[PDB]
Design an enzyme around this catalytic site. Structure first.
Site, mmCIF file in Angstrom:
data_model
loop_
_atom_site.group_PDB
_atom_site.id
_atom_site.type_symbol
_atom_site.label_atom_id
_atom_site.label_comp_id
_atom_site.label_asym_id
_atom_site.label_seq_id
_atom_site.Cartn_x
_atom_site.Cartn_y
_atom_site.Cartn_z
ATOM 1 N N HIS A 46 6.589 -4.674 -8.103
ATOM 2 C CA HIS A 46 6.738 -3.751 -6.956
ATOM 3 C C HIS A 46 6.022 -4.249 -5.709
ATOM 4 O O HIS A 46 6.262 -3.712 -4.604
ATOM 5 C CB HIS A 46 6.297 -2.324 -7.314
ATOM 6 C CG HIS A 46 4.807 -2.104 -7.396
ATOM 7 N ND1 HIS A 46 4.118 -2.110 -8.595
ATOM 8 C CD2 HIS A 46 3.906 -1.766 -6.453
ATOM 9 C CE1 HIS A 46 2.849 -1.848 -8.372
ATOM 10 N NE2 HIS A 46 2.689 -1.640 -7.078
ATOM 11 N N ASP A 96 7.362 -4.327 -14.635
ATOM 12 C CA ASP A 96 6.768 -4.448 -13.311
ATOM 13 C C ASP A 96 5.887 -5.680 -13.206
ATOM 14 O O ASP A 96 4.835 -5.645 -12.555
ATOM 15 C CB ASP A 96 5.970 -3.196 -12.965
ATOM 16 C CG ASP A 96 5.655 -3.084 -11.500
ATOM 17 O OD1 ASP A 96 6.320 -3.772 -10.677
ATOM 18 O OD2 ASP A 96 4.732 -2.277 -11.151
ATOM 19 N N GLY A 145 -3.612 -0.851 -3.214
ATOM 20 C CA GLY A 145 -3.707 -2.272 -2.908
ATOM 21 C C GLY A 145 -4.330 -3.113 -3.998
ATOM 22 O O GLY A 145 -4.585 -4.302 -3.775
ATOM 23 N N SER A 171 -3.035 -3.123 -7.322
ATOM 24 C CA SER A 171 -2.087 -3.539 -8.349
ATOM 25 C C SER A 171 -2.092 -5.050 -8.424
ATOM 26 O O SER A 171 -2.281 -5.746 -7.425
ATOM 27 C CB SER A 171 -0.675 -3.025 -8.084
ATOM 28 O OG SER A 171 -0.092 -3.587 -6.937
#
Ligand SMILES: C=C[C@@H]1C[C@]1(NC(=O)[C@@H]1C[C@@H](Oc2nc3cc(OC)ccc3nc2C)CN1C(=O)[C@@H](NC(=O)OC1CCCC1)C(C)(C)C)C(=O)NS(=O)(=O)C1(C)CC1
Ligand SMILES: [Zn+2]
Length: 199
Positions: A77, A101, A157, A159
């Site tokens: 993502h 993801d 911020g 991830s």
């Protein structure tokens, strides 16, 4: 319908790192916004890379990426299908799994890799893009609770960053926050075993 003017997305660019080499964790910036924009267009990044946890950016987002077993991993993502900028030009993902993801590229020369955890331990530590170290108790295969809940702003911020065991092994990659009324009481992460299977 006009192919000659169709644009290309830029590369993911390493813009800094979370320094964990000493007794204090701290964020370092290694490239500013203007230079990031240019490097994203060219895909050519000559900067020296160091360490396990990188701060990365596209034209529209910034997040983290973590080296484990010689692969720099991050979240789909954040990165989508983008290349990463590298000294010799853009480098194509070697792993892409939208269902998890998860994406990955060959780890940059100069980076250092975390070792996948085999401790079977549930006392974990999440590292954020601000170099905050957040104790997390593992609560399932892919979930952990924050010992001290935080507003999601604090986690935004991060991830792509690591959850580590007490010995400093990689346990997972931070994916999503489990949030109610904007307070993160738990986190969702990609377990390192899933990386190891994806590999
Ligand atoms: C706050 C920091 C978070 C780490 C963080 N993550 C996100 O915001 C991820 C992206 C997206 O979730 C996903 N999107 C996907 C998109 C895909 O293809 C496009 C494919 C697979 C995807 N799989 C997931 C899980 C939503 N979300 C969440 O956390 C949401 N909570 C949630 O969904 O919880 C549920 C229950 C518990 C499990 C899931 C939340 C509501 C915003 C808090 C963060 O920091 N992101 S980021 O760096 O700022 C930034 C946006 C990159 C720059
Ligand atoms: Zn371990």
């Amino acid at each position: 319908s006009h192919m000659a003017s169709m644009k290309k997305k830029g590369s993911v660019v390493i813009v800094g790192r979370i320094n964990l080499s000493g007794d204090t964790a701290y964020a370092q910036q290694t490239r500013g916004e203007e230079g990031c924009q240019e490097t994203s267009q060219t895909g050519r990044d000559k900067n020296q890379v160091e360490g396990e946890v990188q701060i990365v950016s596209t034209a529209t987002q910034t997040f983290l990426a973590t080296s484990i077993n010689g692969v720099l991993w991050t979240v789909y993502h954040g990165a989508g299908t983008r290349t990463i900028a590298s000294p010799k030009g853009p480098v194509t993902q070697m792993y892409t799994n939208v269902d998890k993801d998860l994406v990955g590229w060959q780890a940059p020369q100069g980076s250092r890799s975390l070792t996948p955890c085999t401790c079977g331990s549930s006392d974990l530590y999440l590292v954020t893009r601000h170099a905050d170290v957040i104790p997390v108790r593992r609560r399932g295969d892919s979930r952990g609770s924050l010992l001290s809940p935080r507003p999601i702003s604090y986690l935004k911020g991060s991830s792509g960053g690591p959850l580590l065991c007490p010995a400093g092994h990689a346990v997972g990659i931070f994916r999503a926050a489990v949030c109610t009324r904007g307070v993160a009481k738990a986190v969702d992460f990609i377990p390192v075993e899933s990386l190891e299977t994806t590999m």
